[PDB]
Symmetry: D2
Subunit: 254 residues, 4 copies
């Protein structure tokens, strides 16, 4: 057993949705640094531009696709497989919409569920197919502490519901594919200091409550989430499947 | 503090989705026996008529409606409020479809999610509005042990994902409405001797595994799930909100 | 089943540890009101007398005993059995001590673990023996939200660990005795307005925080814990075993 | 970050209980291969001699002590602190005794709780002191799937209870010390192929059930547990605290 290289992804090809920004991009950084080749997937093709510049030779392909389009995910997987066997998938496309339950537009509910759950299933089915055939693979899904507990003070019931679905989808596929050598796990991050949540701080009433409810008294940095994703994606996690790993500064402890 | 009557529902009106069959119908029987009036909601006209026939005077209204139709849920709640103030909602409309993940029809995924999760939200938003305005109500959602664990050996990853979402939806609404006096809780049943279920033996490996995986070594009876729903619906559960109550013969203990 | 009577305990005899005060005594009131005879167990002779006086004819026996004295629990079960078959046990004896981890004296940690865990086992083994012989019984343990999450701002790591043990002990005995018809479940109450929490409730630095962390914005009343205990002990809960039921005004939801 | 070294422990000194065999020893190998120096802690050498002949220059001190003796732990930290500041603690001492609940002798119960829970608290209190004073530390507790579910078919209620306590202790200390820069996490391993558990092969009425209940269909190798401990001990887990990480081949998913 070589512990010096057990966390590496040498020789792996990893597809990452949401690759162009935030957590997906930092996960790409981690994976690249660890020897993986990348299939970058995003709907914002210029956020892809940014990523490919940074990741250089580690990029095997850049694919523009909406995860909510099942046909487009099946196509992305066929295109990726033609470049190299995809042995890792990271589902890091996810959105959040603030809404009071009683005032929720039907479209808001459907949009969040479609991206966060359905899109995860479309990508997992598409990319998982060849992993299952090969009897080898690792899937890391971006769940949330929102799949375990309910945020405060803001309301976003569709987010909570979608992340509950993400955690059970993770486990469902872990169970179904364990016998065929594909591991499936989720991260459950707390608040993460992405450009996007850091602006969500023009609102001290929200932000101060978030910090006060986190034992570490801070948001997680994107790299702290990526380092956990790297662990779950690597052979270090060879006996880890169907796990929901909290990376939340202690948020779910209280 | 009259413990002899604290589980009763005299003077309350309960709306029940999926009232026509299985667990929803047994819940109706339990609630009627406990003094409640009933708004029966189901997509099947013939089933509703049978249900109404047996339930007699306890029925305040019967509404043929599809829980996946948001507009129909909103109209059902307006109709019900005209006929009786609804202070209890039971979301027992659910479906289950067997599918191997890699062989899943997109429509199968969508329909399971639509009924199990979106429908529960549409009904909860619709009927919950007036509860929240009055500052009083109780909602009981039919979750599942499938919201907590993954069944074996059969595969139904949409069911698992939908039930993860149901458990978190329950909790999100619990948190949002707690200050306005509306409690929202879920049952997580094990295997229950219903149609949904007894039609699966019908693959003879299934039942023997199920029972071997259940400490009590038997399926639950619908009446056993209904008695638990009655607890959560009643004033006995006045300090219970956002709870997921396992009623599974110990299945999730092992 | 007959729902009008499914929550009743007529014909039953329940042993309750911690019967002299608080939740235990309220559970005794609830069980007596529901038709049960009672075995009162408490280390405080004077408190037990007051309880016995109040509870009247419902009291079959009163046993002055320390749950940490395993030999006394053994004799107490033999004494009770000579008087009536005990078919229900409630383990409500329990203590909380505030201590900072680094400034913890060995004896504080020992005593909390001894009363809360060891004593629950001594009493369960003792009273459980004849239930298992008979093929029928129901046990209800007082766990806590502190078996799931960690209280704030006060520290009491021994209490947290003890309640983590209570929850697993509950489930362990549920699994082991399921085949012999003995259900074993736990309640996980949030803050409750008792003697246990009386002083702390005077300190606003603690109490404001407790209320702000509780979605219902109040402690539960003893009767609201007792009503849930009654449910678990009754035939209504006949398919519930190994469950941990949160009765915490939504505390563990956030 | 950088990701090439984020999993390393160069310049750290780690104290490991149960270091002479099984998981504790494999963790020592993992930590040594990652640049750590080691305080080896176990009850009799060798044990520790053969561990030192193996681990070479990595060993800073070898301390013989009983984790159940609160004074031996306090002393042990003091001795270790004289050789090197200890920035990492791994509580890998643990025992399991088979016993049916109704055939349980008091000393069996007390001993399992004393090694698994009390011993963990004494070690954490003792080694935690200097960490909290230095505002930096990481503690990895060996929990178990047995702290989440109940094993089958064998009975060992003290092991389950003790492991529930380990999970909650881990969390309590995470909450208490979050503000003082000490992270505290637990692993929850499934069955691990230590020499001890490999002897069960051997008893196929046990072993074959164990494998049938594990989605991966095999026990984990000690290195698979150690790689996960290394993750939690390392800067890669800097936003992970109060987490229970399942490493169980999916055991707790079903
Ligand atoms: N506080 C937090 O940031 C937080 C908390 C809990 C969970 N998460 C989860 O972590 C993951 C990463 O989020 P982030 O913070 O990096 O986001 P971000 O705001 O930094 O960027 C969002 C990215 O998702 C992409 N995207 C959105 N919809 C898409 C679609 N349909 N198809 C393809 N790409 C799409 C966008 O183009 C963009 O690049 C998400 O799954 C999120 O749900 C985040
Ligand atoms: N083993 C089990 O049967 C089991 C276990 C755990 C949880 N549950 C859940 O409990 C609930 C009750 O189901 P059941 O077990 O009685 O199954 P069942 O087949 O006996 O009854 C299903 C009922 O839901 C109704 N329904 C379906 N779609 C509807 C729609 N769109 N609008 C209105 N009504 C609709 C059907 O008409 C029928 O009356 C479901 O939510 C189910 O997911 C069932
Ligand atoms: N905030 C709360 O009140 C709260 C919340 C969650 C869980 N709980 C748990 O509920 C249970 C009951 O608490 P309560 O509110 O009634 O507390 P209380 O202090 O009001 O009553 C506790 C009773 O237990 C008895 N007792 C203590 N040690 C004993 C021993 N060694 N042997 C026999 N009897 C003993 C005491 O004499 C007293 O009569 C306990 O297990 C407690 O941990 C309490
Ligand atoms: N199947 C498994 O191996 C399994 C499953 C779940 C959890 N765990 C947990 O993993 C951890 C390590 O297990 P393992 O497989 O290495 O066990 P092991 O028996 O192989 O080694 C355990 C070590 O603990 C030491 N120890 C025992 N009592 C001690 C005491 N009183 N003082 C000091 N040292 C003592 C022993 O000397 C031994 O070296 C334990 O905490 C165990 O509870 C193991
Ligand atoms: O949108 C704020 C909250 O609901 C989470 O999605 C954290 O981003
Ligand atoms: O797919 C699991 C199924 O058997 C149950 O949900 C219905 O009984
Ligand atoms: O610290 C948790 C415990 O003391 C509570 O029951 C409050 O009294
Ligand atoms: O440490 C041994 C552990 O695997 C026990 O659960 C065996 O019963
Ligand atoms: Mg919380
Ligand atoms: Mg299980």
């Amino acid at each position: 057993m070589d512990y010096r290289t057990v966390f590496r992804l040498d020789g792996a090809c990893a597809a990452v949705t949401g690759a162009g920004s935030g957590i997906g991009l930092e996960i790409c950084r981690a994976f690249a640094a660890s020897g993986a080749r990348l299939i970058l997937i995003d709907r914002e093709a210029a956020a892809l531009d940014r990523a490919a510049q940074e990741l250089g030779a580690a990029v095997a392909a850049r694919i523009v696709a909406d995860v909510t389009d099942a046909e487009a995910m099946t196509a992305a997987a066929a295109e990726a497989e033609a470049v190299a066997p995809v042995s890792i998938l990271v589902n890091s496309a996810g959105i959040a919409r603030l809404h009071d339950a009683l005032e929720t537009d039907d479209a808001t509910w459907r949009q969040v569920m479609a991206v966060n759950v359905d899109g995860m299933f479309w990508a997992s089915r598409a990319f998982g197919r060849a992993m299952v055939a090969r009897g080898a693979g690792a899937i890391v899904n971006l769940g949330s502490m929102s799949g375990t507990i309910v945020n405060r003070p803001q309301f976003a019931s569709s987010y909570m519901a979608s992340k509950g679905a993400v955690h059970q989808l993770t486990r469902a596929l872990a169970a179904e594919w364990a016998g065929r050598g594909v591991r499936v796990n989720a991260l459950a991050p707390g608040y993460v200091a992405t450009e996007m949540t850091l602006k969500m701080r023009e609102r001290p009433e929200l932000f101060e409550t978030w910090l006060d409810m986190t034992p570490m008294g801070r948001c997680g940095e994107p790299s702290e989430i990526a380092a956990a994703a790297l662990f779950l994606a690597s052979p270090a996690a060879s006996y880890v499947t169907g796990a929901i790993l909290a990376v939340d500064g202690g948020y779910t402890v209280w």
